[PDB]
Amino acid sequence: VAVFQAIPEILNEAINIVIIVIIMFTLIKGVFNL
Amino acid sequence: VAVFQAIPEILNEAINIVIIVIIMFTLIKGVFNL
Amino acid sequence: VAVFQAIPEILNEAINIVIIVIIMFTLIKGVFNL
Amino acid sequence: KLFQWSLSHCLERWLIFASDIKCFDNAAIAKCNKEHDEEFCDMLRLFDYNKASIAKLRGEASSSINLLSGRINAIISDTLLMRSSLKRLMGIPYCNYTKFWYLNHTKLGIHSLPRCWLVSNGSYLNETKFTHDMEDEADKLLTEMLKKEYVRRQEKTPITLMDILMFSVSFYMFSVTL
Amino acid sequence: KLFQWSLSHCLERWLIFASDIKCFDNAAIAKCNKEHDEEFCDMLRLFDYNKASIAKLRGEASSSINLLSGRINAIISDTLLMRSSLKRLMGIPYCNYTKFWYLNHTKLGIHSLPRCWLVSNGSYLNETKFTHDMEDEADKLLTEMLKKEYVRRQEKTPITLMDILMFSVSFYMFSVTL
Amino acid sequence: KLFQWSLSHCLERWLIFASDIKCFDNAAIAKCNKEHDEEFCDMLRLFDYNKASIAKLRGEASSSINLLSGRINAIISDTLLMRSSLKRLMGIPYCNYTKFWYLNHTKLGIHSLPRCWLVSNGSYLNETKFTHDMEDEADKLLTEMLKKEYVRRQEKTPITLMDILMFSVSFYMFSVTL
Amino acid sequence: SLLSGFNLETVHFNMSLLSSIPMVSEQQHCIQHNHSSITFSLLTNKSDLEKCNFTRLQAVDRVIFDLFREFHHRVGDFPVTSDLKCSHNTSYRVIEYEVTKESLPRLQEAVSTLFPDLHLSEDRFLQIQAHDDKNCTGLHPLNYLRLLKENSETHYKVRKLM
Amino acid sequence: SLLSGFNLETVHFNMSLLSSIPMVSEQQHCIQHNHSSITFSLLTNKSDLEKCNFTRLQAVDRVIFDLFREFHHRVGDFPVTSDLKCSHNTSYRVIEYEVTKESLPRLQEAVSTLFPDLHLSEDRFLQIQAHDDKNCTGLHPLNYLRLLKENSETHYKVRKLM
Amino acid sequence: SLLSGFNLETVHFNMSLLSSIPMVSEQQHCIQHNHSSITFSLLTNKSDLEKCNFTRLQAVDRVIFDLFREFHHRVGDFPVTSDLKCSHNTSYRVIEYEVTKESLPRLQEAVSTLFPDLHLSEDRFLQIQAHDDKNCTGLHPLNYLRLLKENSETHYKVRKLM
Ligand SMILES: *[C@@H]1O[C@H](CO)[C@@H](O[C@@H]2O[C@H](CO)[C@@H](O[C@@H]3O[C@H](CO[C@H]4O[C@H](CO[C@H]5O[C@H](CO)[C@@H](O)[C@H](O)[C@@H]5O)[C@@H](O)[C@H](O)[C@@H]4O)[C@@H](O)[C@H](O[C@H]4O[C@H](CO)[C@@H](O)[C@H](O)[C@@H]4O[C@H]4O[C@H](CO)[C@@H](O)[C@H](O)[C@@H]4O)[C@@H]3O)[C@H](O)[C@H]2NC(C)=O)[C@H](O)[C@H]1NC(C)=O
Ligand SMILES: *[C@@H]1O[C@H](CO)[C@@H](O[C@@H]2O[C@H](CO)[C@@H](O[C@@H]3O[C@H](CO[C@H]4O[C@H](CO[C@H]5O[C@H](CO)[C@@H](O)[C@H](O)[C@@H]5O)[C@@H](O)[C@H](O)[C@@H]4O)[C@@H](O)[C@H](O[C@H]4O[C@H](CO)[C@@H](O)[C@H](O)[C@@H]4O[C@H]4O[C@H](CO)[C@@H](O)[C@H](O)[C@@H]4O)[C@@H]3O)[C@H](O)[C@H]2NC(C)=O)[C@H](O)[C@H]1NC(C)=O
Ligand SMILES: *[C@@H]1O[C@H](CO)[C@@H](O[C@@H]2O[C@H](CO)[C@@H](O[C@@H]3O[C@H](CO[C@H]4O[C@H](CO[C@H]5O[C@H](CO)[C@@H](O)[C@H](O)[C@@H]5O)[C@@H](O)[C@H](O)[C@@H]4O)[C@@H](O)[C@H](O[C@H]4O[C@H](CO)[C@@H](O)[C@H](O)[C@@H]4O[C@H]4O[C@H](CO)[C@@H](O)[C@H](O)[C@@H]4O)[C@@H]3O)[C@H](O)[C@H]2NC(C)=O)[C@H](O)[C@H]1NC(C)=O
Ligand SMILES: *[C@@H]1O[C@H](CO[C@@H]2O[C@@H](C)[C@@H](O)[C@@H](O)[C@@H]2O)[C@@H](O[C@@H]2O[C@H](CO)[C@@H](O[C@@H]3O[C@H](CO)[C@@H](O)[C@H](O[C@H]4O[C@H](CO)[C@@H](O)[C@H](O)[C@@H]4O)[C@@H]3O)[C@H](O)[C@H]2NC(C)=O)[C@H](O)[C@H]1NC(C)=O
Ligand SMILES: *[C@@H]1O[C@H](CO[C@@H]2O[C@@H](C)[C@@H](O)[C@@H](O)[C@@H]2O)[C@@H](O[C@@H]2O[C@H](CO)[C@@H](O[C@@H]3O[C@H](CO)[C@@H](O)[C@H](O[C@H]4O[C@H](CO)[C@@H](O)[C@H](O)[C@@H]4O)[C@@H]3O)[C@H](O)[C@H]2NC(C)=O)[C@H](O)[C@H]1NC(C)=O
Ligand SMILES: *[C@@H]1O[C@H](CO[C@@H]2O[C@@H](C)[C@@H](O)[C@@H](O)[C@@H]2O)[C@@H](O[C@@H]2O[C@H](CO)[C@@H](O[C@@H]3O[C@H](CO)[C@@H](O)[C@H](O[C@H]4O[C@H](CO)[C@@H](O)[C@H](O)[C@@H]4O)[C@@H]3O)[C@H](O)[C@H]2NC(C)=O)[C@H](O)[C@H]1NC(C)=O
Ligand SMILES: *[C@@H]1O[C@H](CO)[C@@H](O[C@@H]2O[C@H](CO)[C@@H](O)[C@H](O)[C@H]2NC(C)=O)[C@H](O)[C@H]1NC(C)=O
Ligand SMILES: *[C@@H]1O[C@H](CO)[C@@H](O)[C@H](O)[C@H]1NC(C)=O
Ligand SMILES: *[C@@H]1O[C@H](CO)[C@@H](O)[C@H](O)[C@H]1NC(C)=O
Ligand SMILES: *[C@@H]1O[C@H](CO)[C@@H](O)[C@H](O)[C@H]1NC(C)=O
Ligand SMILES: *[C@@H]1O[C@H](CO)[C@@H](O)[C@H](O)[C@H]1NC(C)=O
Ligand SMILES: *[C@@H]1O[C@H](CO)[C@@H](O)[C@H](O)[C@H]1NC(C)=O
C-alpha cells in the first residue's frame, strides 16, 4: 500500500501529473485492443 | 564482456529478473516477424 | 529555452547522440502515420 | 563504521522511550554512520566508547578517565560541543544533549533521525518555537525517502540493463514502424 | 543549517560586488549548508555569528571577545584557517579570505559558489595562474547543474511511478504484440 | 582538491607494492579528494606536504620542522590520529598507518581504496579477523561502481533530454493508439 | 500541514550505564565516575587540613586525584596567598580551596563550567569531598566533556599573566 | 574553451559591520574591536611608566586588557629582565614592551603573527596605545583568528624551557 | 562468497623520501629529520656535562634543539631536583636527563609516547645523542605526529599542579 500512500503528498508537482496522465492513456489503449 | 560478467552477481533481485524476461519476449516477437 | 541552451555544450558524448537519433526517428514514424 | 570502539544498543537498552517503543531498527542506527553533525549520533559514539572501555579497561579505573584528556575529538565532534557551549554562554537556545525529538510517521512507518530538543533559559523550548524545524524535517523525510529508494535502486540495478531497456524500446519502435 | 547562530545577508548587504549586483539568491547561500571546505561559506558563518553576537551580547563588550578564545572551531573550520596560515608561512599561494571569484554564466544564468582568490607574495594571483581552477569550476558547474536537476527530480518524483511507467511500456508492447 | 600543498605519486614512487604493480591510476588517487576518514588518503596528504616542503623550504631545515607544531590538523585529520592513539592505548586493534589492504577485482579490473591493516598486540591482524570488512568492501565496490556510473551519467546527460524521451514514448503511444 | 500526519516522539539516553565516562550531576553538585563521586560544597568554616601534597595524595588516594585533576587544571594558576588544603586521608577525603578575593575569579570560572548555578562567594571555602558510595542524581557527561575541551583549548587564558 | 562563456566576478565582504569580532589592520598596525583600537608603535625612546599591575589594569581599563590579552599570551613567558610597563591611566593608555635581546624573539614571533611587516629591532620599545576613537583602515578578522588558533594550539612552544 | 573473486593486495608507502617530516624508528629508538638523528639511550652512568643552557644550545646546535624540543615539551615541567645536562658541543652532542623518582613518571609518559617499548628505570639517565650521519631503520612519521598532537591538546595535564 506504499505506492498509494505516497501519491497524495506530492501530486502538486507538474512532472508527476504528466507522468500519471501518460500511464492512464496507456491503459486506455489496452482496453481498446480488448 | 563487462555486460555478461556483472549479470551473475545480482540476478537474485526480482526487478532484474523481471527486466530480463521482458527483453527476452521482445526478441521472440522479432523472431515471429521473420 | 533551457533545453535548447544545454544541448550544444555536451553533444560530443556518444550516448547523447544515440538518444537524439532515436527521438528523431520516432517523429519520422509519426509523420508516416499522418 | 559508526561503532568504531566496540568490536568483536537494543540489547543494552541505551535509549529510553516514553512511547512504549523499546528499540530502533538497525537502519535507524546506521543513519548515523556518516552523520557527525547531529548530537544523537555523538551520544551513540559515547555509548559505544563506554561499552568498549567497560570491556577492555575493567582492570584500572584510573586509566578509564586518564585517557579522556585531549582525546574527546576522537569519540565525539568537538565542533558540536563547542557550539553548544558558545550558544549556552550567549543565551541562544542550545543543545544540552538530553532530549531528542524524532518525527514518527504513523501510517508510512518511517521515522526521522532524532534531533536535539534545544533548551533555553533553563527550560526546554516549546514545540511552537522549533515547529519550522519540524516542518523542514517532515519535508526532508519525504524527499530523503524517495532519494534513498533511488540510491538503493541505483546500487542494485545494472545501469547497463537500463540502457539495454532504452535500446529495447528503441528497436521495438523500429519494429512496429514497419 | 548554514545559519546556526542567527535565529528568530541581502538586507544587511554582507557582500560587496563591483559588477552592480546587490545580492545573491537564497539558493546561492544555501549552497554552503554542507560546505565546510570553502572559505566563502566560512565568512558567511562568521557574519552570522557577528549578527548573533550583536543581538544577544549588546550589553557587555568584554564577553563578546572573551568568548572567541578556544571556540572558533565552532564558528569556522580550523582546518581551512590553519591551511591558510601554513601555506602563507611556506610561500605557497594561500587564501587570505578577502577576494572571492565566482563564474557567472551570462546566458544560462547559473553561477558558481565563490572561491577564494589566492594571494602570493603580497599580490593577488593573476587569472592566468588559476585558470585551470576556472576551467574545472566551469565543468563542475555544468555537471553539478545536471546532477542537481536529477537530484531534485528523484526527490520529488515517485520512483514507484517510474517503475509503473516501465511496466506500462512493457504491457503496451505486449498489447501491440497482438 | 586532494593535493593542496603541491602546486605548479606515480613519478616519485610514493607507493610500494609487492604485487608488481608500480602505480595507481589518477582516478584511484582522486577517490581521496573528499575522503578525510581514511588513513591512506591522510598519508597521501602527508606525502604531498612533504613534496611541497622539499620544494619551498629547501633553504632552512629548522623551519621545516618548526612549522609542524600546532599545524598538523591542516595536513592530516586530527580525529583519525587521536582515534589510533586511543585504540592503541586501550588495546583495541588500531591503525598504525603502515600496511594498507585493497581489494583488486581480477576480472572486472576495479579496485577499492586501500584501507588500513589494523594492528593489535604488536602483530598485524590476521585476514580472518577483518574478513567482515573485506566482504563489506566487496559489496561496497559493486554498489559504488553502479552508483558512480549513475552519477556520471546524470552529470553528463541532459535530464531534460530524458524527459523529452519520456514525452516521446508518450506521444508514440498516442500515435500507435490510432 | 505536513507535520499533521507525523508524530513527535522523545528519545532519552540511558546514562546509568555510562560507568567509564565521568558524569556531572548539577542538581547535587557532583562529579561521579563509576561508583566514586566528588561533591562540591561551599563551606563557610575553615578546616584544619594541611597543605596539599599532590604526590602524597596520588600515592594514597588515586580516585580523588583523578576526579579533581581536570577541575584543578581548569582553575589554572591558583594564587599562592590562597590556601589549598588536602586531607590526605583514606576515609575523610576533602580538598578545600580558599575563596579569596584574588582566587574567586578562577574558582568561579571553573565551577560555572561544571555547575553553572553554584555561585561562589568571598570568605568561604570550596570543599571537594570524595564518596565511594554516594549515587548522585542527574549524571550527564556533557559538563565533563565541556571541561576537557576548555582545558585543552583555553589553558593559556587561565594562566598568570606575569 | 569552457571559460570563454563564463565571466569572472569578484565578491568582497563588508567588514565594516563586523563590530563584535576584533579585526587587524596591518596597514596601520592596529587591532580594533568595535570603536576601540590598539596601535602597535616601535618607539625609540623609554617611557616613564611603572611596572605592569594587571589586576589594576583590569579594574581600571578593561577594554585595553581585553584587546592585548591574546597578543600577550602569544608573547608567552616574557623575560624578567625585560621591562613591561603599563600606564594604568584612563586617558593616556600605553603598554610598553622593552625589546631586549632576550625578549626580541618572542615579540617578533608575535608581531609577525599579527603584523608580518612590523620588524622589531633591539634597543627599542613596542608601545600598544589604546584609542577609543581611532578608525583603523584595513580591518580584517583573519589575523586575530590566526592569533587565537596559534594561542590555543602552540601555547607550549612559547613557554620557557627551564 | 563475494570475496572469492576479489584478491587481497598490500600497499606500503615509501617512507625513505619523507625527508621534511621527522620520522620515529622505534626499533633503534631514533628520531630522524632529513639526515639528522637523535638516539635515546638508557645510560647507567653519570656524564660530566654541565647544566642545560638552552639559549647557548640554540645558538650552537640548532639541529639538536629542534629535534628534541617537542619531546622536551612532552616531558613538561621537569623537576628542579632532577638534573638536565647539555653538552653544548658541536661534535659530541648529548642531552642527559636524570631519571629520578620524581622525574620518572614524566619521562616515561614521554618515551612511551615516542618509543612504547623503552621502559625507563630509576637511578639512570636518558641520553639523547645527535648524529649527523646515522641512518635509523624503521622511520615512520606516526609517532612524531602523535607527539605533536599530545603536545597541542594535553599540554596542561603535564604541567605541575602547584
Ligand atoms: C581520617 O579522618 C577521620 C575522620 O576525622 C579520622 O577518624 C578519626 O580517627 C581518630 C584517631 O584514630 C579517632 O579518635 C579516636 O577514636 C577512637 C574512638 O572512635 C570511635 O568513637 C568516636 C566517638 O568517640 C566517642 O565515642 C566512643 C564510643 O562510641 C568513645 O570511645 C569515645 O571516647 C568518645 O566518647 C566516633 O566518632 C568514631 O567513629 C569511632 O566510632 C578512640 O580510640 C579515641 O578515644 C580516645 O581519645 C578521645 C579524645 O581524642 C578521648 O576522649 C577518649 O577517652 C580516648 O582516650 C584514649 O586514648 C587516648 C589516646 O588517643 C589516651 O590518651 C587516653 O588515655 C585514652 O586511652 C579517639 O576518639 C576518631 O574517633 C575518628 N573519627 C571518626 C569520625 O571516625 C581518621 O583517623 C583520619 N585518618 C587519618 C589517617 O588520620
Ligand atoms: C594620564 O596621562 C595624561 C597625559 O599625560 C595626564 O594628563 C596630565 O595630567 C597632569 C596632572 O593633572 C596635567 O598637569 C597639570 O595640568 C594642568 C594644565 O593642563 C592643561 O594644560 C596643559 C599644558 O600646560 C600649559 O598650558 C596651560 C594652559 O593651556 C597652563 O595652565 C600650564 O601652566 C602650561 O603652560 C595641557 O597639556 C593639558 O592638556 C591641559 O589642557 C594644570 O593644573 C597644571 O599646571 C601646573 O603645573 C605645571 C607643571 O606641572 C606648572 O607649570 C603650572 O604653573 C601649574 O602649577 C600650578 O599647580 C602646581 C601643582 O601641580 C602648583 O605647585 C603651582 O604652584 C601652580 O598652582 C599641570 O600642568 C597635564 O597637563 C596633563 N596632560 C595632558 C596632556 O592632558 C593624566 O593626568 C594621566 N592620568 C593620571 C590618572 O595620572
Ligand atoms: C666535544 O667532545 C669531544 C669528545 O669528547 C671533544 O673532543 C676532545 O677534545 C679534547 C680537547 O681538544 C681532546 O683532547 C686533546 O686532543 C688531542 C689528541 O686527540 C687525538 O687523540 C685522542 C687520543 O689521544 C691519544 O692518542 C693521541 C694520538 O692518537 C695522542 O696524541 C694522545 O696523547 C693520546 O695518547 C683521540 O681520542 C682524539 O680523537 C684525537 O684523535 C691532544 O691535543 C691532547 O693531548 C694532550 O693531552 C692529553 C691529556 O689530555 C695528554 O695525555 C697528551 O700528552 C697531550 O698533552 C699535551 O697537551 C697538554 C695540553 O692539553 C699539555 O699540558 C701537555 O704538556 C702536552 O703538550 C688531548 O688529548 C680529545 O682527544 C678529544 N676527544 C675526541 C674523542 O675527539 C671536544 O673537544 C668537545 N668540544 C668542545 C668544544 O669542548
Ligand atoms: C609529600 O609526601 C611524601 C610522602 O609522604 C610520606 O608518606 C605519607 C604516607 C605520610 O606518612 C607522610 O608524612 C610521609 O612524609 C614526602 O616524601 C617523604 O619525605 C620525607 C621527608 O623528606 C622523607 O623522609 C626522609 O627520607 C629519607 C630516607 O628515605 C631521609 O632523608 C630521611 O631519613 C633521615 O631522617 C629521619 C628524620 O626525619 C631519620 O629518622 C632517619 O634515620 C634519617 O636520618 C627521612 O626519612 C620520606 O622518605 C619521603 N617519602 C617518600 C615516599 O618519598 C614528601 O616530602 C612530601 N612533600 C612535601 C612537599 O612536603
Ligand atoms: C595592583 O593594584 C592594586 C590596586 O591598586 C590600587 O588602586 C589603584 C586605582 C591605585 O590607586 C593604586 O595605587 C592602588 O594601590 C593593589 O592593591 C592595593 O594594595 C594596597 C597595598 O597593599 C592596599 O592598601 C592596603 O590595603 C589594606 C586595607 O585595604 C591595608 O593592608 C593597608 O592599610 C594600612 O596601611 C595604610 C598605609 O599604606 C594605612 O593608611 C592604613 O590606615 C592601614 O594601616 C593598605 O591600605 C590596597 O587596599 C589594595 N587595593 C585593592 C583594590 O586591592 C595591588 O597591591 C597592586 N599590585 C601590585 C603587585 O603592586
Ligand atoms: C648561556 O650562554 C650564553 C652564551 O654563552 C657564551 O658563548 C658560548 C659559546 C660559550 O663560550 C659560553 O661560555 C659563553 O658564555 C651566556 O651569555 C653570556 O653571558 C656572559 C656572562 O654574563 C656574558 O659575558 C659578559 O658580557 C658582557 C659584555 O658582553 C659583560 O657583562 C661582561 O664583560 C665584563 O666582564 C668580563 C669578565 O667576565 C670582563 O672580561 C670584561 O672586560 C667586562 O668587565 C661579560 O663579558 C656574555 O657576553 C654572554 N654572551 C652572549 C652571547 O649572550 C648566558 O649567560 C648563558 N646562560 C646562563 C643561564 O648561564
Ligand atoms: C550574472 O550576470 C547577469 C548579466 O550581467 C546579471 O544580471 C544583472 O542582474 C542585476 C541584479 O538584478 C541587474 O541589475 C542587471 O540589470 C542584470 N543585468 C542584465 C544584463 O540583465 C546577474 O545578476 C549576474 N549574476 C550574478 C550572480 O552575479
Ligand atoms: C538502562 O540499562 C539497564 C541495563 O540494561 C536497564 O536495566 C535499565 O532498565 C535501563 N534504564 C531504563 C530507564 O530503561
Ligand atoms: C567500576 O567498578 C566496578 C566494581 O565496583 C568494576 O568491576 C568495574 O570494572 C569498574 N568500571 C570501570 C569502567 O572502571
Ligand atoms: C537539559 O535541560 C533540561 C531543562 O529542563 C534539564 O532538565 C536537563 O537536566 C538538562 N541536561 C543537562 C545535561 O544539562
Ligand atoms: C556595509 O554595510 C552597511 C550597513 O548595511 C552599508 O551601509 C554599507 O554601504 C556597506 N558597505 C559597502 C561598501 O557596500
Ligand atoms: C559597540 O559600541 C556601541 C556603542 O558605541 C554599543 O552600542 C554596541 O553594543 C557595541 N557592540 C559590541 C559588539 O560590543
Ligand SMILES: *[C@@H]1O[C@H](CO)[C@@H](O)[C@H](O)[C@H]1NC(C)=O
Ligand atoms: C589579501 O591580500 C591582498 C593582496 O593585495 C590585500 O590587499 C588584502 O588586504 C589582504 N587581506 C588580508 C586580510 O590580508
Ligand SMILES: *[C@@H]1O[C@H](CO)[C@@H](O)[C@H](O)[C@H]1NC(C)=O
Ligand atoms: C622510494 O623512492 C625512491 C625515489 O623515487 C626510489 O628510488 C626507491 O626505489 C623507492 N623505494 C622503494 C622501496 O621502492
Ligand SMILES: *[C@@H]1O[C@H](CO)[C@@H](O)[C@H](O)[C@H]1NC(C)=O
Ligand atoms: C636535507 O639535507 C639536504 C643536504 O643533505 C638539503 O639539500 C635538503 O634541502 C634538506 N631537506 C630539508 C627538507 O631540509
Ligand SMILES: *[C@@H]1O[C@H](CO)[C@@H](O)[C@H](O)[C@H]1NC(C)=O
Ligand atoms: C605497524 O605494525 C607492524 C606490526 O608488525 C610493524 O611492523 C610496523 O613497523 C608498525 N608501524 C608503526 C609505524 O608502528
Ligand SMILES: *[C@@H]1O[C@H](CO)[C@@H](O)[C@H](O)[C@H]1NC(C)=O
Ligand atoms: C547506590 O548504587 C549501588 C550500586 O551502584 C547500590 O549498591 C547502593 O545501594 C545504591 N545506594 C546507595 C545509597 O549507596
Ligand SMILES: *[C@@H]1O[C@H](CO)[C@@H](O)[C@H](O)[C@H]1NC(C)=O
Ligand atoms: C627621543 O628623545 C630624544 C631626546 O629627548 C629626542 O631628541 C628625540 O626626538 C626623541 N625621539 C622621538 C622619536 O620622539
Ligand SMILES: *[C@@H]1O[C@H](CO)[C@@H](O)[C@H](O)[C@H]1NC(C)=O
Ligand atoms: C570614526 O567612526 C565613527 C563612527 O564609528 C565616527 O563618529 C567618527 O567621525 C569617525 N572618525 C573619526 C576620526 O573618529
Ligand SMILES: *[C@@H]1O[C@H](CO)[C@@H](O)[C@H](O)[C@H]1NC(C)=O
Ligand atoms: C646513510 O645515508 C646516506 C645518504 O642519505 C649515505 O651517504 C650513507 O652512506 C648512508 N650510510 C651511513 C652509514 O651513513
Ligand code: NA
Ligand atoms: Na586543540
